[PDB]
Amino acid sequence: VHLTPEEKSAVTALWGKVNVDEVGGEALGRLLVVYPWTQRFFESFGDLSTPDAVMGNPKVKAHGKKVLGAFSDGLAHLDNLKGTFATLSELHCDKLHVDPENFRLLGNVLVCVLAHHFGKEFTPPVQAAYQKVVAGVANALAH
Amino acid sequence: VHLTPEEKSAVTALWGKVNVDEVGGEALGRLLVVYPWTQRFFESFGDLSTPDAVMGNPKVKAHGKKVLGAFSDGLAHLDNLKGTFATLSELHCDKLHVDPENFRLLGNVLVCVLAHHFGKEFTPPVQAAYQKVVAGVANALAH
Amino acid sequence: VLSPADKTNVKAAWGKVGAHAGEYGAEALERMFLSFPTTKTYFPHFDLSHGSAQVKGHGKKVADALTNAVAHVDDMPNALSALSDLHAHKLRVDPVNFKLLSHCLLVTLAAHLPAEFTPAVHASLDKFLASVSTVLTSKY
Amino acid sequence: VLSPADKTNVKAAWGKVGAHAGEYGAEALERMFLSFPTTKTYFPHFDLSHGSAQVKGHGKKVADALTNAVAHVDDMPNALSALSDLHAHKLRVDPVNFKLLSHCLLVTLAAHLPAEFTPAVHASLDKFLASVSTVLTSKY
Ligand code: HEM
Ligand code: HEM
Ligand code: HEM
Ligand code: HEM
């Protein structure tokens, strides 16, 4: 992803403040609540019935922490997102058959989570930078 | 696009029978009728009000012949769709700002046109091969 | 949202589909399973070969469900509520797949009724199947 | 299609948006114009800088349109028929852009009402804005 110096400094500065253990299962859980067909991909996580059962689910917190692990690894490699995400695109495309549009959905949910955890600190330029980063990650997994 | 010998022989044999002069402007015209926001991109073609005004429009026929020119050029280069479609992706992305999903839409409309012009001759394996071709062209233009 | 005119075009088009409906829905399922193989993951319990009896009978059910949706085109959420409860709650089908099946339905209607696929009838059936897809993927 | 519960969540959440609606819709427009610049092609006649008066007043218009879309949430297509006639007949807005604006609305509601963005309220407002986007892109 081509970014400015100021967009990389904003993404880095706001991403350093991110509670990984919380924002992960927050974004994955809101993915399962807002976009419920994605629950088909996580049927081995247990009860996913209510939103309070999804947001209170320890496999959703653990796996969401894995997903933010992959996002932080994509932030350390913004010029090499296809080289970072080839094994994960292999997994999500062949073994899991996840549609590419779903990746975009998760990324947008992540941005909402960031706004929900940063408020006025999540300015429209910070959203612009995280949007083109997030689109870089989703387009790196759709390959 | 990976295809079998039988899929390339079916696409080649079915495509040799294609009237370019009709299938082009009919695919572009059904794109403008079924998906009307695409008419915003063709406001210099004149009256696009009714479906009989879109199908009775010579710039839609001429430009549709250009589009099937690009599809036949993509059929001569099935292993090199990104090298065939870099100038056209530059045009449709930078100068025209056409959303990538629209390419998929046109390709699906083209497949309907082929079924509409071949009937029982457009078998489900022939559709499967043209779906991989069409998805290869749309993913080659979305780059 | 359908107009009056596209409701007229959909009711006329499926009125001339008629008794070929299970044939056309079975062919549409074979076109979806053959051109879009990821949809086969929703049917691990079918025999998905060509000319299968279970894809035939299931296409009869899909086509009768669409005939029922044409008959109740102005209150599709109240009529397709059992099928919304099936596809949205139990099965949890990705809506992308619905677009895929809708496309294959259109291709079947292109391959068997060329005198009926006017571009206006094409746009009408496309918005109809998008409305049915919007109904079946949502929860009540 | 909305349930009873998500109509409750949308009316409650937007009712607590309330009088901040103009600055929230203006902020949502600045987020769309800044993060998704292709949408700027629909506004060649605006001044699209930050803190513009015309993006402010237009965001007041968008927010009031969503307010009486919440008010007529059971019968959106005849309440938004003038705006469907604007966005679908005259402007021909690609529905992708609607998704974009819907996302920016959600981001604004995430950045200003964290006590209100329950995940259920998020799902409710998301499929609400998808219903509004389905109405405004439709042509009827
Ligand atoms: C868009 C960004 C995404 C990222 C960065 C991401 C990240 C990851 C990572 C790192 C794993 C590996 C877990 C492991 O090997 O232990 C994984 C697995 C998985 N992902 Fe994602 N993912 C994304 C999108 C999605 C979406 C949108 C879905 C489904 C709707 C999905 C479904 C899955 C599933 C089912 C697994 C296997 C976990 C299991 O079976 O328990 N992923 N993902
Ligand atoms: C697989 C899909 C497509 C192919 C193969 C294709 C091919 C072409 C070709 C060959 C040209 C002519 C370029 C030139 O004359 O210099 C062109 C131009 C153009 N295309 Fe497409 N196209 C596709 C999809 C689309 C779609 C979906 C849209 C809009 C919704 C679109 C909008 C345009 C426009 C506006 C032009 C410029 C023509 C003018 O301004 O008069 N294209 N495309
Ligand atoms: C316009 C779209 C559709 C209609 C009208 C429709 C209609 C139906 C009907 C009538 C049934 C039978 C209900 C029953 O026997 O209890 C059914 C079941 C089912 N549908 Fe669909 N369907 C549609 C789209 C889809 C799509 C796109 C998929 C997946 C890619 C899908 C997957 C299934 C599955 C897995 C079943 C269960 C069949 C079984 O377990 O034997 N449906 N649907
Ligand atoms: C999602 C919900 C949306 C709502 C509720 C909405 C509402 C409105 C309203 C109230 C107006 C003013 C009508 C008038 O003054 O005559 C308007 C105009 C307009 N809208 Fe939207 N809109 C939405 C989405 C969009 C999107 C996504 C775009 C483009 C990317 C867009 C582009 C425009 C344009 C270009 C105008 C004309 C502006 C002008 O006349 O100066 N709208 N819309």
Numbering used by the authors:
A (entry chain B), B (entry chain D): 1 to 143
C (entry chain C), D (entry chain A): 1 to 140
From the study:
Here, we expand upon our previous results and show that biological specimens amassing <100 kDa can be resolved to better than 3 Å resolution using similar imaging approaches. The resulting reconstructions possess well-resolved density for bound cofactors, metal ligands, as well as ordered water molecules. We further demonstrate that conformational heterogeneity in specimens of this size range can be discerned. All specimens in this study were imaged using a base model (i.e., excluding imaging accessories such as a phase plate or energy filter) Talos Arctica TEM equipped with a K2 Summit DED operating in counting mode using the Leginon13 automated data collection software.
Khoshouei et al. recently demonstrated that a TEM operating at 300 keV combined with a Volta phase plate (VPP) and quantum energy filter could be used to resolve human hemoglobin (Hb), a ~64-kDa heterotetrameric heme-containing protein, to ~3.2 Å resolution. We therefore sought to determine the structure of Hb using similar strategies. Briefly, vitrified Hb specimens were prepared from lyophilized human Hb (Sigma Aldrich). UV-VIS absorbance measurements of the solubilized Hb sample confirmed that the bound heme was indeed in the ferric (Fe3+) oxidation state, hereby referred to as methemoglobin (metHb). RELION reference-free 2D classification yielded detailed class averages exhibiting secondary-structural elements and various recognizable views of tetrameric metHb. Three parallel 3D classifications were performed to select for unique particles comprising the best-resolved classes across each classification. Local resolution estimates indicated that most of both maps were resolved to better than ~3.5 Å, which is consistent with our ability to resolve side-chain densities throughout the maps. Notably, the heme pockets are estimated to be the best-resolved regions in both states, and the quality of the heme densities in both α and β subunits of state 1 enabled us to confidently discern the location of the vinyl groups extending from the porphyrin ring to unambiguously assign the orientation of the heme moiety in each pocket. Our ability to discern subtle conformational differences in a target as small as 64 kDa effectively underscores the utility of this approach in examining the conformational dynamics of similarly small biological systems. Moreover, the results of our work with ADH and mHb demonstrate that small-molecule ligands and discrete conformational states within a single sample, respectively, can be resolved using conventional SPA even for smaller complexes.
